[PDB]
Each structure stands twice: as C-alpha cells, then as structure tokens.
Amino acid sequence: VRFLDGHTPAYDLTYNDVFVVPGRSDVASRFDVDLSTVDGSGTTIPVVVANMTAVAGRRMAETVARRGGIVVLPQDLPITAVSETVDFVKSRDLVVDTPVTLSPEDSVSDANALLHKRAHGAAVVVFEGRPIGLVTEANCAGVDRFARVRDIALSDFVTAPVGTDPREVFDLLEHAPIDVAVMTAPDGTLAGVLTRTGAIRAGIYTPAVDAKGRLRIAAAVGINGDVGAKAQALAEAGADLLVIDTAHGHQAKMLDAIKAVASLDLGLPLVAGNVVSAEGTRDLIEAGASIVKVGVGPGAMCTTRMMTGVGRPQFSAVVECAAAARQLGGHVWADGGVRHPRDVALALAAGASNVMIGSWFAGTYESPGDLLFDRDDRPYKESYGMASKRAVASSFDRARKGLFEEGISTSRMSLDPARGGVEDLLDHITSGVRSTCTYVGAANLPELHEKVVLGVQSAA
Amino acid sequence: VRFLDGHTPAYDLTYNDVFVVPGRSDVASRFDVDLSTVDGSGTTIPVVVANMTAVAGRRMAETVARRGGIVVLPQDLPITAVSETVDFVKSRDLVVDTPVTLSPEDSVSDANALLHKRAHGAAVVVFEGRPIGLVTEANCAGVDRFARVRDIALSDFVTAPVGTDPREVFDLLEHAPIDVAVMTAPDGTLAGVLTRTGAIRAGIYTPAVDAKGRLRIAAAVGINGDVGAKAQALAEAGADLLVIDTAHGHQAKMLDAIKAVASLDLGLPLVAGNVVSAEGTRDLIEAGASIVKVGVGPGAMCTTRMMTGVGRPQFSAVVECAAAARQLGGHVWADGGVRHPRDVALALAAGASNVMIGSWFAGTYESPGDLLFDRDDRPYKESYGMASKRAVASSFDRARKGLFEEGISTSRMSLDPARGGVEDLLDHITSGVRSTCTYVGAANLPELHEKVVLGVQSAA
Amino acid sequence: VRFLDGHTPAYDLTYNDVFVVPGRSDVASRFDVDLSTVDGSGTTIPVVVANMTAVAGRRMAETVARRGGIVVLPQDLPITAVSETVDFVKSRDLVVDTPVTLSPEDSVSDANALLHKRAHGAAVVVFEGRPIGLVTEANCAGVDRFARVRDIALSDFVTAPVGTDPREVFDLLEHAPIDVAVMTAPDGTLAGVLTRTGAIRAGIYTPAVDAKGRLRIAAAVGINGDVGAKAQALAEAGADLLVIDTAHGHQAKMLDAIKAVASLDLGLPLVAGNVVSAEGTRDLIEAGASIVKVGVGPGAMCTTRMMTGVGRPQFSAVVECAAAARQLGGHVWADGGVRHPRDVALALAAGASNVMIGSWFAGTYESPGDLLFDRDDRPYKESYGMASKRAVASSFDRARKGLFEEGISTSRMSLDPARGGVEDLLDHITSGVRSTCTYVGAANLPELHEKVVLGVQSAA
Ligand SMILES: Nc1nc2c(ncn2[C@@H]2O[C@H](COP(=O)(O)OP(=O)(O)OP(=O)(O)O)[C@@H](O)[C@H]2O)c(=O)[nH]1
Ligand SMILES: Nc1nc2c(ncn2[C@@H]2O[C@H](COP(=O)(O)OP(=O)(O)OP(=O)(O)O)[C@@H](O)[C@H]2O)c(=O)[nH]1
Ligand SMILES: Nc1nc2c(ncn2[C@@H]2O[C@H](COP(=O)(O)OP(=O)(O)OP(=O)(O)O)[C@@H](O)[C@H]2O)c(=O)[nH]1
Numbered sequence A, B, C: 001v002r003f004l005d006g007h008t009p010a011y012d013l014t015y016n017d018v019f020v021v022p023g024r025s026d027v028a029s030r031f032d033v034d035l036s037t038v039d040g041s042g043t044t045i046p047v048v049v050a051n052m053t054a055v056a057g058r059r060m061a062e063t064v065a066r067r068g069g070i071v072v073l074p075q076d077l078p079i080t081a082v083s084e085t086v087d088f089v090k091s092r093d094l095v096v097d098t099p100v101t102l103s104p105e106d107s108v109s110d111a112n113a114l115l116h117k118r119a120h121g122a123a124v125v126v127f128e129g130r131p132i133g134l135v136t137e138a139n140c141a142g143v144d145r146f147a148r149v150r151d152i153a154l155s156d157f158v159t160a161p162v163g164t165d166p167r168e169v170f171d172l173l174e175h176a177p178i179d180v181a182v183m184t185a186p187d188g189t190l191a192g193v194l195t196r197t198g199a200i201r202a203g204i205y206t207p208a209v210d211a212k213g214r215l216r217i218a219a220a221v222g223i224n225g226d227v228g229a230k231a232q233a234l235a236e237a238g239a240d241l242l243v244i245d246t247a248h249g250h251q252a253k254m255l256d257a258i259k260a261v262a263s264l265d266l267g268l269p270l271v272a273g274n275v276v277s278a279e280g281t282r283d284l285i286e287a288g289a290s291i292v293k294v295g296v297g298p299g300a301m302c303t304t305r306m307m308t309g310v311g312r313p314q315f316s317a318v319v320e321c322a323a324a325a326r327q328l329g330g331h332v333w334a335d336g337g338v339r340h341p342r343d344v345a346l347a348l349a350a351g352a353s354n355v356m357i358g359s360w361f362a363g364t365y366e367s368p369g370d371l372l373f374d375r376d377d378r379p380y381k382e383s384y385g386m387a388s389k390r391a392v393a394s395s396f397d398r399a400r401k402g403l404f405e406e407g408i409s410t411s412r413m414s415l416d417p418a419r420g421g422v423e424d425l426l427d428h429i430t431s432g433v434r435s436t437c438t439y440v441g442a443a444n445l446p447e448l449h450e451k452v453v454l455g456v457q458s459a460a
C-alpha cells in the first residue's frame, strides 16, 4: 500500500480514517473490470458470507453462489444438515432460481409469509411437481387468512423451457403483468423461475462453480474437539472450502488444529482465523493454512473491545496481515465491520483477496431469519453472533461456564423496502468496487492493490 | 306490563328509559330459575344469534346450541354450504366440544393462528385420527414460524373416554398443567375436548336438541325470488327453525311470502320480521307466522334512523308487539340493540319470548371473523350489517341498484382479553337475567313478564 | 299529522325529538316513489338550495337543476351578474354536463386547481372549441407547475355524439382508462361531458325544466329598497321563481313587500319568509305569497338563539305552518337545520313541499367557494351566513349600524373524500327519503304527509 507523502499517523486506521486518491485511468466502463478472486476460493466477486447461523442459510448459499460469492456454513452445524444443504446447493441451476412452491390446500396465511423467503415477489403453485398457478402478495391482501391458495392464485402465467436464452426470457416478461417466468422441464414439471432482474444478473455475474459445474459452498469448523475428524466429514459432505474459525487465532490450540487438518491432505483450501498481526499471519500460514482470516474486535465500542480492550482497527490490520501473507504466497480475508460498499473496496485496496460480510446480509429475504416488523411496520430481521461457537471450551462446570460466558447480542437489521434481496446488496457492493477500480485505473483486483494511493483524513 | 303509578310518559321508551322495581320474592338462588322458553324453538335460554354473516358461523352454531341457544344461519347462504353446516352441528356431542386439530406436519404459523378459533387455549395433535399431543400458545412463543408441530408438542395430556362423568373430568384437571382434557372414542380416536369450565356449563346449561337429540340450528330466508323453494330446501338440509327476514316486514311482498311457506306445511316454526307496530304484528301472525321478530331502527343514531327517520324505541316496540302477539297466540322476538344483559332482561320483562343478539357476539373467538389486533395489541373482531340481503330486490342495472343501496357499515367489536369466548358472554347474560327473576320473584320466563313492575327514569 | 297515543309532550319538537313509525306498505322498491313536488316550483326532488353566497353558485345551479332541484340565487346580487348566470343555466344540456375546459397554453398550476370545480375528475382540452385531449389529476402529478397543458394531455378519449343513448355511453366506458366521455356537437365542437355514474342519474333524476325545456332557476330579493323593480328585474332576467327573504318575516315591511310584488302580476311562484307561527303563515299568504319559508333560529345553540332567545324547534314549526298554509291553498318550505337525509324526510312528513338546504351543500365541488385543505391535508370548504343581507337596513352611519350588526360567522364544511360532489349528497338524501316512503307506504310526497305516523323519543 502506498500513502500520500506525510500521511504517517501515530495511530492505526479504521475504514473511516482512509480515502482512495484517484489515479490516471484507462478503464472506461465498470463492466471492463474483472472482480474474480485469486485466492483459490473460486469466487468471481470478492464477497464471502460469514459463518453465522443468522446469515449463512441454505437459501443464502444458493443465492450468493449463483452471483459469484460463496457462503461458509456455520460451525457445529450437524453433518446431516450440512449434507442436505450441500446436496441442495450442488443441485441448483446456474441461471434459474428456486422459487417458493405452494399447494392449493395451503392457507393464505402461510402463502403470504412464505413469499418473503425469496426476492421474487411471486410463488409458484404446484401439483405433483408441475406449475398450475402463481401467488403474489396482492392476491393475499384483504383475503381470509385461512382461505385456500386455489382461491387467490392466478391461473395464467409465463412459461419457458429451461435452457432458453435469458435475453429471450427478458423480452417475454416485458409486457407480462407478473415479472416472473416459470421455467419448466421438457415433461412440464417445475424447474424454477427467472425474473427480468434475474435475467440481467445472469449476464453480469459469473456463478462460483466447482470442477463439476455446481455452485460452490464452504463450511466452518471450530478448534474444539476432533478438528481433523470434523474437517474430513465436511470435505466428504461436498464442501469446496474449509474455514478453521476461532476468536483468538494466534493460539497454540489453533496451530495444532491447522496442522491436523492440513496433514490429512483433503485437497481443499484452508482458511484460518482470526488474527490481526503479522506474526499471527505467518504462524497460521506455516501451520498449513492457505488463507488467513483477519478481524479481532474491529469496533472500538463493540463487545470484545468493551469487555477486554483487545482488538485492532481493521484497515491497519488488513494492511499488515495482507503484506505478511503476500511474502509467504498466502492470502487474507477481511472479516468484520463491513457496513457499506466502500468498506469492501478499502479492504481490497489494503491487500485482502476476499471480504467476509455477516450482519449486513441478515437484513435480506434470503437470510435464515424470519421477517419481522416493528411498530412502524418496517421490515427487519434479527442478527446475532456465534458467541461460544467461536471460543475454546459436572453440572457445577456447566454454570461455571455460563457465569463468565459471552452474552449473545441481538441487533435489528432493517430491510430496504424497495430492494430487500441479498442480490440487491450484491449489486450495490459490486457497483462501488467496480467504480473504485475505475477511479484507481485498475482492470482487476490485483491491480487495485497495486495502483491505489491511500490517504488519511481527520474527523471532519 | 305494569308500570308505577304516574309513569305515563309522552314518548316511547328505549332500554335506557326504564327500570325494574323489585318485588316480594321467595326464589332463593339463580339456579332455581327456569330460563327455558315457550316459543317452540327449543331454547333453554332466551338467546338467539342473529342471521348475520359476521356472527352466524359454524363454530358459533355448535358452541351456543350446546349451552341452550340457537344460531340462525344468514340468508342467501348456498344450500351446499348450509348442508355442510347443519350436518356438522347435528353430529357434535352435547357435552364434549370440538377441538382445534393439528397435523404433525402443520406449521407453527398455522398452529398459532388456529388456536384462537376456539376458547380452549390448546390444540390437539392428531395422527390418523388419534390424539398424540397438545399445542398451546406458550409452546409456539419464540419458536420459528415455519417449524413443524412435531417440534413443540407436549406429549402428555389428560385422557378420559367419551361419556365420562362431567363432574369427574373436572377432578382430573385439578392440578393439570393445561386446563384441557382430550376425550377419546372407545377405539381411541379423537372424540373432542372438554375443559374445567366446560364441565360446569354442562351441568348448568341444558343443550337445545330436537326430537333426535341433535343440536338445534335455524336458518334465514329472504323475501326475494321464490321463498317457497328456498325455505323448503333449508329444512331438507336439516333445519329446525326458519325465519322470513326483511328490513320492513309490514309490506305486501312479505305477507305473500309467509302465506306461501305456511301452505307448504313443513311443520316448523316460522319467524317473520320486522315490525314495531301492533298492526304489523297481527298481520304477520294471521299470514302464517308463529313468531314475529321485532326491531326496526332501534338506535336513534344508526343507519336506518339517520337515513330515513323511520324506527321506534325497542322497548316500547316489544311491549306493544308482545301484547298483540299473545292475543293471537303468537310470540315475539326482540331483535337488535342488545349490548348489556339488562337489555335481555328488559326485553323479556316487556313480553318477548327470546332475545336476538348479534354484534355483541362478533367480538368472540367463535365468530367467523378473523381475530385482529390494533396498535395496542388488544384483540378485536369487526362486525358488519347484511345491507342488501335484508331489502327488497346487466352492469347498468347493478349500477342503478348500488347507487341508492345501503352501504356496508363496519364497526370494531373488542374481545375481553380474559373472557373472549362466546360462552363467557352466555355466562354474563344468563347470570343477570336469572338475578332479574330473583329480584322480581319469578321462577321462569313466563312468570317474569307477569310479575314485573316497571318504572321510568330521566337522563340522570 | 298523526302522533302515537299519549305522545303529547309539553314542548316543541326538533328533528331529533321525533321518529317515524312504519305502516302497511305495498310500495316494493324505492324507484316506485314519485318525489315530485306539488307547490308549483317544478322540482322533481324536494331539495332546494339556499340563497346564500357560499352555496348558491353558477356551477351549483346547473348541477342541481339537472338532478331535479332548484337553486335560489342570493339577494343583492347585481342584476347583470344574475342574467349571465341565468342564461348559462338556461343554455345547458339536460343530460350532458359542463366539464372543465383548458386551452393548450394553460399552465399546469391553473389546470390542477380548475379540476376540483366539478366532480368529473378530468378536464377537456379544446382548440377553437373542439376537444383534443383530457387532463386528470395523475397527468399533473410531479409535473413542473408552470409547464403547459400540451405537456401532460392524454390525446385519446371516449367520444360520442350529443344525444347518444346514455346507457351505451355507460357501456362504452366499461373498460375505459378514464371514467369520462366527451360529447361532441355535429360540427365536432365540445358539447359537454358525461361520466358513467352520470349516465345512471340521467335515468333516475328528471331535470326540472321550465315551459321551454330549459333548466329551472330561482332568485331571492331583500325587502330593502325597491322590492318591486328588483323582483320585476329578476323576473325579466329569466327567473322561474322568486323568494322575498328576510330574517323576521312576520313584520309590516315584509307584507308591504309581498303586496308590491303581487301587484306586478309577474306570473311566478312567490316564496316568502321567514316565520315559525301559524299567524305569520296566514298573514304572508293573504299578503300575496304562494309559498311560506319557515325557519327562525332552528338550532338551540346558534347565533340567533344565543343572542336574542328568539327561535322555535323546526319540526313543530313546520307542522304548524304547513297545516295553516294547507287550508289557505298554499305550501311551506322547511329552511335551516338540514344535516342528514332524516331531516329531509321528517320535514316532508311534517307537511313541507320542499326542503331548503344551505351549509351542507357548501362542502362540495360545485359550491362557489374554493377547495381548501387543513393541516391533515383533508379537503374542506368554508360556509358563512348572509348576515346583513337578510335584515332590515355617510360613513358615520355605516359604523353606527356596524356596532350592532350581525357578524359573519364562518364554519368548516368537510368534503367526503370519496363523495365530494353535490350529486352524491342528492343521491344520499333521495335514497333516504324514498326509503321513508316505503316504510310509511306512500307512493309520493302528498301521500307521505297523510300516511305518516310520528312518535316522540327521549334523549336516549
Ligand atoms: N410450502 C413450502 N414450505 C417451504 C418453502 N420454503 C421453506 N418452507 C418451509 O419452511 C421451513 C424452513 O424454511 P427455510 O428457512 O427456507 O428452510 P431451511 O432449510 O431452514 O433453509 P435456510 O433457513 O435458508 O437455511 C420448513 O418447514 C419448510 O418446509 C417453500 O417454498 N414452500
Ligand atoms: N388444520 C386445521 N384447519 C382448520 C381447523 N379448523 C378450521 N380449519 C381450516 O380453516 C379454514 C376456515 O376455518 P373456519 O373458518 O373455522 O371454517 P368455516 O367452515 O368457514 O366455519 P365458520 O367460519 O365458523 O362458519 C378451513 O380451510 C378449515 O379447513 C383445525 O382445527 N385444524
Ligand atoms: N380556463 C378555464 N377557466 C375557467 C374554467 N372554469 C372557470 N374558469 C375561470 O375561473 C373563474 C371562476 O370560475 P367559477 O367560480 O366557476 O365562475 P363563476 O361564474 O363565479 O361561477 P360560480 O362560482 O359557480 O358561481 C371564471 O370566471 C373563469 O375565469 C374552465 O373550465 N377553464
């Protein structure tokens, strides 16, 4: 990283303390920029969903991986649920999305609530796997909450076979009353849906796929118990990437957990964290980790900082850790504190290969949380931390632990009433990162870190 | 009716204008009073549910008929929907109630909403018709809205075979955690539900049953179209009582209807309304009606009175109509304006054999309307009038009719958060009427009308 | 007028003190009722617009006359301004209504404000008298306030020649985007406008026409100055009915004003008022008046009552004055206090031939006042009394009279956000009056006066 002359502050820098200075650019348009990562994760956009049960859901894993990101499944998830989630994601179409299915015998109450689990705005009514109707929120307004789906469902809708050019599907939905195209298999069964916005994103985002052309998905594991046995079970379940996650990564028990998983030679990239120092980055890479996750108490007013005073401003943490990992041929993930697309752009300019986002994506339709409304009828969803699931471990001991255990904090994540889907946030994030590369003059992410000139600003 | 000396006002009297003067009494308790009625309806309490779609529902018809009342199904209801309702009510137990049934695959969302369809406070989980668990609102609090009923269900409950002593099923629920007892058939199937309070009301209220021991139920017909074919079809569905209902009963089109239905000879009591005059009362009785329903614009600031000025104070209307109907051997029903149990007591003291209650029963769990909550989270249900379904009967023709047609007014009926069931209102209404007979000195309703001394009061 | 037995109160009755008892009826529908008046006014509905400058406007005169009513122009209006208003009403189509006309050069500011002067919801754009497009509220939303009409006008609209069957115009507007049909003259010029709902009122209301088939219109005149030449000028200006109006009609100066106008032999019905006594009714008709207008401080808390104590309840005043005028071969007008259709029915049942309504019609689009909005953005228009223009009359003398002069009170009249038109109030009033005739059993207004049976009620 190269700073303006004189910008050598006597303190570490957060995402608010820095700014990017424009440089001479030949990149004309934002779509000429290549946002694909080079850390072996397979993501075509530098966005990784955090391994938190409030964010890393099954619907999130399919939706983010189709647009180029990847979702790390939260640790301590039962291996049976992991296999069912991987099998679902690995069986999704790379263009056609999974709609919400309804039976004619379902209630209008359930039909209205299930609609908000996807950003499509319409649910497909099915009978023996074949579409027979559509249900929108306008069809449920003012109707008996225990009327059947057959009482409000639209009988006519746009159908198209799977494999049709999204360009043609985009024109089919031009004058359709419902902006949903029900994609069918040759035998007439339901294969999914595709909207006008969904057809545009197919031509902008490249899905993150494995060697077999299936959507990518990652899984996390704690350093408690048999790390090698849990890691091998996640690899055989179909995981494309493994995250060895703990609160304090610069720990002896973490170094042993990396050497245990790395010695098994599972043929998968190993992410380990978290640390915020150059020494902790090299010790994790030499232990057998390919990627180092950076982020320990990034907020000066958050739980970790207010309880222990331990932490480090994230931008200065990524700068030091990415430079240390570059000398060993490793990579760095910027984890924590991402609130706006400039946080993603500044993390990449600091030297990170990917950006891990958690609580921000909780306020979306695709997050595993239930959609809630406040007194002002504003849509929101709750986000919460993993707490003990990232820390190291008689009935006397059970409450001896809870006496000092970290409390689970809960926050309200408001949804945008016009763009409540996670793909809308992906549009917002990638739009800013692409413009940053244009301001710097970079055609790809490696050039962004190469050609960027940073500066420090005061509180004003 | 006997009034105090000098109480000859130059105006008609509402329920607010009059009071009952206590007399010498030997009736000890309320239970000595016989609230049975003598109008041929078979009601052991003088409570009739009005023929309004906002109140006269299926769950309403079953609940109050067990406690001695009768529900008049709203007119113009399709004969198939009637047939499904009568065959339902006629097939219920005279003590054991119908619970809220849940499948193990139902969602918590539907389970939480289905609970308020009854006053039991708990739902029965069934598999192949056998009770296997219970679901209360405490079991759904804080649970995922789309979790399964298998994830929350209490596996243990109180079991008693159908036909068990209503006093005994009380004893088992003494220290039970949930105040519900699931009754089972001899082969183990779900027979129904009985709570503690349901055991007392089984020993206080006598079920209103026909010759076959099945719960009573009535139906309404409109004077439009062919009344003969409609009224004959309602009794073929299993109706025990028919009412020829219209806004202005003292008209020629009305008189011709009863003379048509009375000549059909179905052997069922015919009720007709409305009139608020002795002339209109006698003309309806001689037309073939056994009971006359009284009530034309009882409120001084309601739709009929403020649009047309036509109406009459309900108390003075029932007094005149009851005296004229008794001379011809007919009886009188007091319809509309009932808000407190003293309105029922004063209508009986005026000479009516039954009291038709409507919007007051809309704010109950058993009403067909959905349970709604305002901004203060207080339960309420909306009531609305029949409008054109009580008046005399091509988009151009539909526009001429709707231009002058009566608007469908809607009002908010709040539920008691502690006593939200319709049986609680039955306990509230009957307790005051029984206490009214004790003050007068009557052992039954025919004695109440003959022994009561009335008086007039001012606004203070 | 017949009252119930015993209903002989020791006080006079307002519209709130009385109610109508329904009797035997053979009138099936409301449409079988003939609302025609028999006082020689020519109105097919018993609705007369008061002679107040806040309601008796040009647009009100045309809109009410087409639906069967008549509008009395306020006194002291310049005779030149009267002739231009009378000629406008006399030159109007008896079915097709006058829309809002816009020049292509008009601003969006003026077009947006001119839309609310009629109840059509759209304005016609004309060039040299021929319609070319429509302007609605949605056309002006979010548009530059000083753009031209040529920037927002919808070029296509529904066209039908003048004289077309109104039911076909109703059918053509079935699925039209704007509920507006532009009627064209043979040469293509703008003949006027006709809406859907307006096509139905053409087949329900009969226009009040004069001997030449033109819309009727009345005018008022004070008793100050030359009552003869003013009444002679108003008659020669085209007035179909004259009103000699004053605050206290039972005075000598009023009788001399009737004798002066009667000696002219203008051949027009003469209305005189106001009085509330039979003696005042006898003296007015014997002076030469054909109709007596009754109303002196009808409200117990209005300006006249609280300042002077002079007044009389309107119902008892109309009953006494109608019976007195009936024996002299005249009729009576109920003036003041009209707030609901109940007041119109009770006034007619009392014996009145027409009901005069004032401040109620001020809260309409057709009233001459400007449409205003309060802090809640709710539509309203202000009403005010004639004050000095209804009483008996240097700058020092002007202030000597102003020291005791009646102040001009101002009240807020709210528009119905869904029924801001005066025709909607006419639909609301006539719907209730027609229902009153069905309850009583009358086929027209003369039968209503005899067949009605009144009763007295208390405050409850
Ligand atoms: N009928 C119907 N039920 C659905 C649908 N999607 C989810 N559900 C039900 O909702 C519950 C779980 O919903 P999801 O949250 O989408 O499922 P999940 O596997 O937990 O996935 P994530 O929360 O995204 O990790 C289960 O009871 C499902 O049966 C749908 O499209 N139709
Ligand atoms: N699973 C389940 N569904 C129910 C239960 N009770 C009612 N429903 C369903 O809820 C819907 C409407 O119920 P109700 O409104 O009580 O039925 P209804 O026949 O209209 O009866 P009323 O409204 O009381 O006249 C129907 O689809 C019923 O099948 C129950 O206990 N369990
Ligand atoms: N361009 C245009 N101007 C209009 C239109 N209607 C009214 N105006 C103008 O606005 C003025 C006031 O309108 P009105 O209040 O309806 O006219 P009025 O003759 O006072 O009639 P009333 O208020 O009904 O007694 C008129 O003198 C015209 O200058 C219209 O349709 N188009």
Ligand SMILES: Nc1nc2c(ncn2[C@@H]2O[C@H](COP(=O)(O)O)[C@@H](O)[C@H]2O)c(=O)[nH]1
Pocket (backbone or CB within 6 Å): A050, A051, A052, A274, A295, A303, A304, A335, A336, A337, A338, A356, A357, A358, A359, A360, A384, A385, A386, A387, A388, A390
């Ligand atoms: N202190 C703390 N950090 C957490 C907890 N759960 C997750 N985290 C960290 O915070 C990150 C998410 O930060 P966010 O993107 O929501 O600002 C996670 O990726 C993880 O590194 C928790 O319970 N406590």
Ligand SMILES: Nc1nc2c(ncn2[C@@H]2O[C@H](COP(=O)(O)O)[C@@H](O)[C@H]2O)c(=O)[nH]1
Pocket (backbone or CB within 6 Å): B050, B051, B052, B295, B297, B303, B304, B335, B336, B337, B338, B356, B357, B358, B359, B360, B384, B385, B386, B387, B388, B390
């Ligand atoms: N005017 C009028 N009366 C109605 C309407 N619907 C029902 N009613 C009458 O009002 C009664 C119910 O009165 P409540 O018990 O709600 O005071 C009904 O039994 C019926 O006689 C309606 O739309 N308009």
Ligand SMILES: Nc1nc2c(ncn2[C@@H]2O[C@H](COP(=O)(O)O)[C@@H](O)[C@H]2O)c(=O)[nH]1
Pocket (backbone or CB within 6 Å): C050, C051, C052, C274, C295, C297, C303, C304, C335, C336, C337, C338, C356, C357, C358, C359, C360, C384, C385, C386, C387, C388, C390
């Ligand atoms: N006291 C009083 N009466 C008025 C005034 N202006 C009009 N009136 C009377 O009130 C009538 C209108 O009554 P409204 O229909 O508004 O209830 C008029 O027809 C007229 O008789 C005024 O300034 N003062």
